[PDB]
């Protein structure tokens, strides 16, 4: 849902914009690659798996 | 000849009536135009602030 900006006094003289980050976005292989690559940020494998 | 001036004078009346007509429509068109300028501002505003 491209957040374009209308700039030119002519129509469609616009600035494309892209935002894709969020708390559930972290090390985006393509997306979440399971518990890793989005979800250590979300799920935090620090409980005992690390020990 | 005095026929020609009678028809002349009435035709100058018709000319003046012309001027006031054409100026009536004209000024009305300049008002329309002022709208259209505000409209164009409302196109770059209906630019959706881009989005």
Q: Which residue has the tokens 């690659």?
A: A33
Residue A28 CA to residue A38 CA, distance in Å, equals 6
Technique used by the depositors: cryo-EM
B51 CB neighbours in chain A (<8 A) are 1-5
**Cα A42 to Cα A45, B16, B34, B35, distances in angstroms:** 9, 82, 56, 54
Interface of B with A (CB under 8 A): 43-44, 47-51
Q: Which residues of B14-49 are buried (b: 16+ CB within 10 A; e: fewer)?
A: eeeeeeeeeeeeeeeeeeeeeeeeeeeeeebeebee
Does any CB of chain B come closer than 8 Å to the CB of residue A14? Answer: yes
The answer to whether A33 touches A22, Cβ cutoff 8 Å, is: no
Residue A21 CA to residue B51 CA, distance in Å, equals 19
Residue B18 CA to residue B30 CA, distance in Å, equals 18
Angstrom resolution of this structure: 6.7
Instruction: Show the 3-state SS of A1-51.
Output: CCCCEECCCCCCCEECCCCCCCCCCCCCCCCCCCCCCCHHHHHCCCCCCCC
Q: Which two three-digit tokens encode residue B44? A: 């770059």
């Amino acid at each position: 849902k491209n957040l374009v900006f209308q700039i030119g006094a002519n129509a469609t003289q616009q600035i494309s914009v892209n935002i894709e980050d969020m708390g559930a976005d972290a090390l985006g292989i393509k997306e979440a690659d399971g518990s890793i690559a989005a979800l250590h940020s979300v799920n935090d494998l620090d409980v005992t798996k690390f020990a | 000849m005095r026929g020609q001036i009678r028809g002349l004078e009435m035709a100058s009346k018709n000319s003046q009536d012309g001027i006031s007509l054409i100026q009536t429509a004209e000024g009305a068109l300049t008002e329309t135009h002022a709208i259209l300028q505000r409209v164009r501002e409302l196109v770059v505003q209906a630019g959706n602030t881009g989005t």
